[PDB]
């Protein structure tokens, strides 16, 4: 069951995808609001996948070994330049994480997008499934696709001051490495900003 997504001009097709899961909404809330008085301009040159490497799923890591990436992460792309030059911007997180395994090793990995992420207590990790999430396991799907609408207390919040969504990868089941299976499984994320707006053009150096 292949799924061939697209964002801007880059595409990421996974022939093992199990399904896109929308978080908390399907389409982002209204964009022109009481603030910005209509000074927002939707940028589309920034909807682009940008890879990031994460923790190398290794069997040593036990249940509860959460790996957290804060979005938006440092970006050398057009979006990274846009956040530096624009005081306020809002974009859908659309996180995609793919862990490639031989499928002869059974490991259950839970990838979720949690708003206002906080150090989660060991007991909180058991109840971590409440947030939008998908399970990445070599037995069935090596790729998890999650689309989350941007949600913040303010309509637009400076990304440098605060980041609303942090991708969290948790090893629900320790990878069961086998001779046939891959010794270790890496975890890469194809994150892409979606519905990215900006406001308040900011003076450059």
């Amino acid at each position, epitope marked *: 069951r292949i799924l061939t997504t697209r964002n801007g001009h880059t595409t990421s097709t996974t022939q093992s995808s199990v399904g896109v899961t929308y978080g908390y909404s399907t389409g982002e809330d209204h964009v022109s609001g009481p603030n910005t008085s209509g000074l927002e301009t939707r940028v589309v040159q920034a909807e682009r996948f940008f890879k990031k490497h994460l923790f190398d799923w*290794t*069997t*040593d*890591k*036990p249940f*509860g*070994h959460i790996e957290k990436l804060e979005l938006p992460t440092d970006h050398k792309g057009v979006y990274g330049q846009l956040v530096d030059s624009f005081a306020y911007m809002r974009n859908g997180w659309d996180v995609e994480v793919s862990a490639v395994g031989n499928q002869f090793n059974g490991g259950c990995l839970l990838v979720a997008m949690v708003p206002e992420f906080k*150090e*989660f207590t060991t007991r909180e990790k058991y109840q971590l499934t409440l947030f939008p999430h998908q399970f990445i396991s070599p037995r069935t799907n090596m790729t998890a696709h999650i689309t989350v609408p941007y949600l913040g207390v303010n309509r637009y919040d400076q990304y440098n001051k605060h980041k609303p969504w942090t991708l969290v990868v948790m090893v629900v089941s320790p990878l069961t490495t086998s001779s046939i299976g891959a010794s270790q499984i890496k975890v890469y994320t194809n994150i892409a900003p979606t519905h990215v707006h900006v406001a308040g053009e900011l003076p450059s150096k």
Partner: antibody, heavy 124, light 107 residues
Framework: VQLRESGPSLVKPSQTLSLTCTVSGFSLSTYAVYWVRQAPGKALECLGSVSSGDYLTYNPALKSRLTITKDNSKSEVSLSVSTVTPEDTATYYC?????????????????????????????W | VLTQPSSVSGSLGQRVSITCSGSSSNVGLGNYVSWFQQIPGSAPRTLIYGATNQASGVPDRFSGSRSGNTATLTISSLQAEDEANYFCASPDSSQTIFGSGTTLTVL
């Protein structure tokens, strides 16, 4: 880079004890210190680990009988085993990591003692 | 719990191998075994970290390899001065387990 621990004398059964492991030429802000003891005639036993970002992991059995506090500026790690019993007589070691160790509340024994490539162990 | 031979004796100038026996849950789970050599009355030294790489500041004679559920530490041209107790530190499920330890005697 040497580790020095200060331990009390005979502690009466059913009391607590505070051991302080004093690091030297050491970050304690980018490294992690573990607490391992060896009951005589037994194998070593992970007591608990304090990561770089002051996140703690404790031996599941000796958990609730044990606390670990770290102060990076004073550069000393502390261990407080409550409810001491005659079984807890042992020599108590403190170790170094080669990396920060997990900054999570993972709940494992040490969690990093022999993890992966980056973090293994350092001069006790 | 990473059981090891209580006493291992190797003639000086002859390669000696120490075997740490572990279950699938700990030693067998992954190639992440740490070997520590402790001299009596002194803090132990991590001779091998990760079970395939010698730690920095350690002699190259020590060789570390792990096969199946058993991790074996091999010392080549063992010297009387270097003789000390050996511990096969490994990671168990929900805790870290250390080998009982092996006494090394040079004839």
């Amino acid at each position: 880079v040497q580790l020095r621990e200060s331990g009390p004398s005979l502690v009466k059964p059913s009391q607590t004890l505070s051991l302080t492991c004093t690091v030297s030429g050491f970050s304690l802000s980018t490294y992690a210190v573990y607490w391992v003891r060896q009951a005589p005639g037994k194998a070593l036993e992970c007591l608990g680990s304090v990561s770089s970002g002051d996140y703690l992991t404790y031996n599941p059995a000796l958990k609730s009988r044990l606390t670990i506090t770290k102060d990076n500026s004073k550069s000393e790690v502390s261990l407080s085993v409550s409810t001491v019993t005659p079984e807890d007589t042992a020599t108590y070691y403190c170790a170094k990591s080669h990396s920060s160790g997990y900054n999570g509340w993972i709940d494992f024994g040490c969690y990093e003692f022999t993890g992966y490539g980056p973090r293994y162990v350092d001069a006790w | 719990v990473l059981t090891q031979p209580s006493s291992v004796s190797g003639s000086l100038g002859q390669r000696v191998s120490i075997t740490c026996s572990g279950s699938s849950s700990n030693v067998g789970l992954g190639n992440y075994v740490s070997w520590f050599q402790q001299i009596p009355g002194s803090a132990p030294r991590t001779l091998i970290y990760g079970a395939t790489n010698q730690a920095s500041g350690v002699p190259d004679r020590f060789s570390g390899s792990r096969s199946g559920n058993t991790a074996t530490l091999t010392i080549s041209s063992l010297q009387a001065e270097d003789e000390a107790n050996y511990f096969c530190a490994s990671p168990d499920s929900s805790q870290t387990i250390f080998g009982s330890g092996t006494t090394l005697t040079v004839l």
